[PDB]
Symmetry: D2
Subunit: 398 residues, 4 copies
Amino acid sequence: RPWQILSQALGFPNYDQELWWQNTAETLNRVLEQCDYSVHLQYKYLAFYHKYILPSLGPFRRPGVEPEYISGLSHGGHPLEISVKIDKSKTICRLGLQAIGPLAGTARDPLNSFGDRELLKNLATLLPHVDLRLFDHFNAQVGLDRAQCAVATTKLIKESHNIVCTSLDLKDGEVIPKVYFSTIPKGLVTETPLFDLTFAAIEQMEVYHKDAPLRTALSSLKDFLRPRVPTDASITPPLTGLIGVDCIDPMLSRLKVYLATFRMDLSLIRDYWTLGGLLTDAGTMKGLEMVETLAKTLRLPFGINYAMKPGTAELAPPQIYFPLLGINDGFIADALVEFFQYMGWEDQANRYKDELKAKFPNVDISQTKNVHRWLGVAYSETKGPSMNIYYDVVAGNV
Amino acid sequence: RPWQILSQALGFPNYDQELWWQNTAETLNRVLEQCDYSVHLQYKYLAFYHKYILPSLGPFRRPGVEPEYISGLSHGGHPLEISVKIDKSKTICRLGLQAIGPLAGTARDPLNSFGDRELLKNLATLLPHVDLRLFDHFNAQVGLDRAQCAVATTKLIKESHNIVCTSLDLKDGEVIPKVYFSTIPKGLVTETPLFDLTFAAIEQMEVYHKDAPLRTALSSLKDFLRPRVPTDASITPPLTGLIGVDCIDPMLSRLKVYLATFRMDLSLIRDYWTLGGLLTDAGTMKGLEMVETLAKTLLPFGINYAMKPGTAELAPPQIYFPLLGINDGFIADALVEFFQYMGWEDQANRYKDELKAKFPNVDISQTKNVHRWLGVAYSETKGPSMNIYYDVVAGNV
Amino acid sequence: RPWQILSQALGFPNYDQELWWQNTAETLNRVLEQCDYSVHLQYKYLAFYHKYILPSLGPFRRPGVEPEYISGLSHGGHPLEISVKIDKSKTICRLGLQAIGPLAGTARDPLNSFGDRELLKNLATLLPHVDLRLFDHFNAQVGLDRAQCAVATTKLIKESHNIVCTSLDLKDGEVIPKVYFSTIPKGLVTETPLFDLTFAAIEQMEVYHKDAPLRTALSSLKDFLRPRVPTDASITPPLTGLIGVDCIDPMLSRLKVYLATFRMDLSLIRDYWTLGGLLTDAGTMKGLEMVETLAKTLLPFGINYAMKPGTAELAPPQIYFPLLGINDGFIADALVEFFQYMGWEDQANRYKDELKAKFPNVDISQTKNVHRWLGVAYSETKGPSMNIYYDVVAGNV
Amino acid sequence: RPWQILSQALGFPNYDQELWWQNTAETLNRVLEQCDYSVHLQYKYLAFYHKYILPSLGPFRRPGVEPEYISGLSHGGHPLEISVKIDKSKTICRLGLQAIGPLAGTARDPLNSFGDRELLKNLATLLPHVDLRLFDHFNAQVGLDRAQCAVATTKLIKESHNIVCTSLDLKDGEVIPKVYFSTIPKGLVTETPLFDLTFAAIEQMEVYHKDAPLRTALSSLKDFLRPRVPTDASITPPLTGLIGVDCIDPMLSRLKVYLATFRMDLSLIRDYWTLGGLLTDAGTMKGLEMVETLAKTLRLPFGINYAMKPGTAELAPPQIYFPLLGINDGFIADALVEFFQYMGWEDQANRYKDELKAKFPNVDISQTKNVHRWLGVAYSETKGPSMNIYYDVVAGNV
């Protein structure tokens, strides 16, 4: 098995990296197999993970070892998540993490401000298509200096001492990095409405100055969000909580504005999905029906993620993220099978439970309530409907 | 002794680091002593230099070893210079370098795009006042992706395959980093006038949007520069070739726009110094006299305009004279004469002996390489100041 | 100041290193000052400590963080002690530690078998006089393979999962390393009497084969020890529990055989001190008086016999009294009284104030942990000497 | 292809490691394929090579970069060799190298005294069967201090500034390390006959003191060597130039005494092979015939390597190493095919030339004279005849 062969060939520079491997790499090999990645790509991505991601994961939080930095990415405070994106034709795998610097959560680096950029730098030398210019732009506009990071830690719970996190799409051979920057620490430290600091940063992008369509699609999103998110500096929902970019050519990168909210019901789903009645086409409404039905078939906030691309003036429906923490995972798996049937993805319906068990062989998933963390649903004009399932891999292994 | 004591205590991770120490650290300790730094600051800066700078300097270019990356900072291609800033009351030391990444000058990193930031990151964890937000801003607006870097290396000589360089001011007990971003690679690759890509980047800064006085000073500067630098995408001097920032709180950082040109004569000096007749005060003119006299007593010339948030009015630039190719004994004689003109008699009396002490392995009467630049400035607050830049490796062999 | 200056200049690669500095380096600078080391040696040793020792110390055991490897060197399980060696004329400082590998105490490295050698290797490139041949010799003869290590951890408490430990004498301007190899793990795992595996290892040394006097001194020692330590494979005290060497030129290295025992009384002290009546001279007896008086004025006891190539005659051992569990204010009162007995009046006058200065964060009148060992020795050449070992972390919290 | 996939997944920490990969890893993948290693073992050994061996190879000597340390392992001064061991039933691959420390060939480490041990330490944490006790023993007895290493560099050519080298047998899944220690530097510095310093070190081994059979087989080898190698301190052939051990349990490790000599002819081959007429059995004579015929079918010295094992009192025939540097490689390949025919290994005969070309796709091997470096031949009582072919991999690639 590739995950075992790599463990035998490579070993580990320290015990925390060994623990990370023993609690994630079998699941990851299983995910990749299940997505129909060849043996050669299983080796490619597992080798990549060993080299680049293990040292980025910091100490492995366990009984008797409590790290200085606790991530909000998972239930046990581990800075890792693995997800699958399922559409009509294929399934791809994504890793999500926070790259932990070795002074993270101490006075020299209170919000873990360096590690993700250091990982990205290493990815830029590894991969020709990786471009750090958007990272740097948003790191400049929403990052904080050390004294501001210290202030921010006095206003935030320990699991939200973060400014950025990273996702790596493992798309048929390649690694595509994306990042999300949090707006809340700067909002809190500077007492600036989140809406305002989010669009001020976006509107300073070079590509925004160059690209009329991007500007127009943003102007439409702002008209939608302005009356719905706070106008004052409050941290109350719905709120613009993250800005996302792809770490590629900025002319090709999708810019994402992610809203966090607790309140959701069928009419709110319509509101977010259609942008308050702005989108009325057959495609949009067909996706709306899908999402309504997912919500029927089925604590962290809901997520609503609006994505825009240079060259496109019109907004598309967001991706909607359902929070599944606290909800029994056997129930989630029953719901998913039912939903996959509704979609007519019969193969997915027939495999989901067996594949789930196989992904997590050392825990009885029927008894957990923290292994499924999120379910994202999206509908594309061109590419079809898509579903993104996010797992707390360490919850599924310990 | 502090340089030797640190060498004995610490040793070296590899031979290139040992060669860098053996060819720079004695001079550096000498510079620090001569600026009246206490023994405790000598250990401070030298320990700092050993830990942070030696690994950033890359391979030590020498007979038989030709690095993949060659720096234009020095005559032998070594990415290092040491300078002193002399004013009425004190002398401070500064290090200038390019932090070399381990894949610099290869297909994975053609313009050495990563090393300086990696060094700055480690400084940010070392030093509470170090703020990387202005770095990241300009790296975003003037940096290039890998394919663009590769294109840029086909249009530029080996010694200009750079996007950024770093200075570290060793000022009282602190280290203050500054960086300069080059505009030429992005100008060449994108065919964008250097003037436009420079002010477009500056005008996207958050502090520019927040600060009315800064926006006023910049409009004055753009009025001055627009008719003087190219309006098309040519790399035709005079031109806006670097943007500089201090890696501190952006409300306190000085923004610098640096012009490069190969023509200088009295009429041009006056034009640059006074901003085309805008500055006419007794201060400005007392400085202009200095500069004219320096040029008489005596690589492109440099002209560096500096702006600070909160200040609407422009000051005279710093002007940089290239000294490469000119005998260093002559330079030292000229400087002694100039220091006499200034009435800095102490400096005049010490300069030649302190120079010899800085560089014991060379004889300055025979080199033309060791003095590389002379910067002269004047400000109303602080007085006249002079910056002398040395090729430390040239002075040591 | 030197400890603070180095902290400002260097910072820290990770938080465990920063915690080690914050809990040891001020005391260490205090010890060095008190031994009259010049400022330049203070920077020397402290810079050395920062670079070589901090990364060797592993994670800093603290509430919420429990390392996979726990050292028996200190009460809290930290692999560090600092000691002073006081004689008539001078006081020198020494560091004792276990260099922790990153997989120490896990299946890949159960007895921490690699870290000390890795540190010694880096010292050998740092220091021309450091010679690893005696290390490698004893590591070969008393070290264990992985399966044997795993067996040994099933037979030994967590705090005795070790094969070697290292001392660094900070003597004049140099660093002199020494190591001690434990015989017990190989004794337990192979069921070989400790006496036999100790002398078998020693008798295979090249210097033993080359040097007649050494072979004579060792035969005398074996005669003394054979009837006193176990002839079977028991771990029954008194026993030969460590072999020590200096990591220098094997012709100059002192070989040490260390006995551990839990019984001591006047008749045993005399028996160990005089080698069962072999040494009867005025020197030996003046030392025995010292030792008896120290025991009166006041973990196994230790008895350390030292031999040198070129010397056929045995000297009195160094005797180590365990002080764990005994009030440190009392210990300090006892030492002042003892130093008076010795006529070292300066030491008597400074001891309690210098102690307080070494450990400002604790109150010694209330701790029982800070003094860990007292070693006493006498030699005809050099006089009496006393070695006091402190749990530096206990003294700092 | 595994070597390419690993290059894509992993990249390189510096340019010298990248150059090492680009000039060795394709050949290595090709060797492993040709030895019938599965895809999973190709990944295992290539991943191992990337992690452990690349950083050990030091700077890649090339036009414009002349390292401080030059290895005598290859023609261009590169510290690497790859070999194949061919017997009746199978072929296995071995790597040979010198692990270069970062101060090697400078005043702080004149004979590269540290790097091999540092690599071995890392192998001991990677692999449970690795045992460093013999390494340490011989490092103690024949190693030199820094002042002695400096003296030795004044008496030795630059390519012989070495005290140890390492071989890694890639035997069906496992890595088995062996080392060879040079006796010449200590011989030169101390003015001690090589014979005497070699057997003095061996006779201090713990296993020698414990094992009557080992002692007896050594006593027989010494009776053979004493009248044939120098009695004074001269460095003249035949001489005992290396001591080899396996870095495993010392009760299982074969101890090797390697002789270097320039003069060889059929009667010398008999002398070495039979230990001066001591070995007269049918097996020995059948192997002698083989070796005579190899010599007929067919500058560095010849090697004669006597191997002994605890528990065995009787000596076996040595392995005899023919130096092939300077000899056209197309000629060597013709000779090998002819020899393989003589042996009746017809498959090897039919493949050798095509496989050779395929191992070295970027150089025309018919035109080189430095790619084959050594040919070792051995005959085993139990395991049969064996042939070891050593290649200068960098010579075959640049």
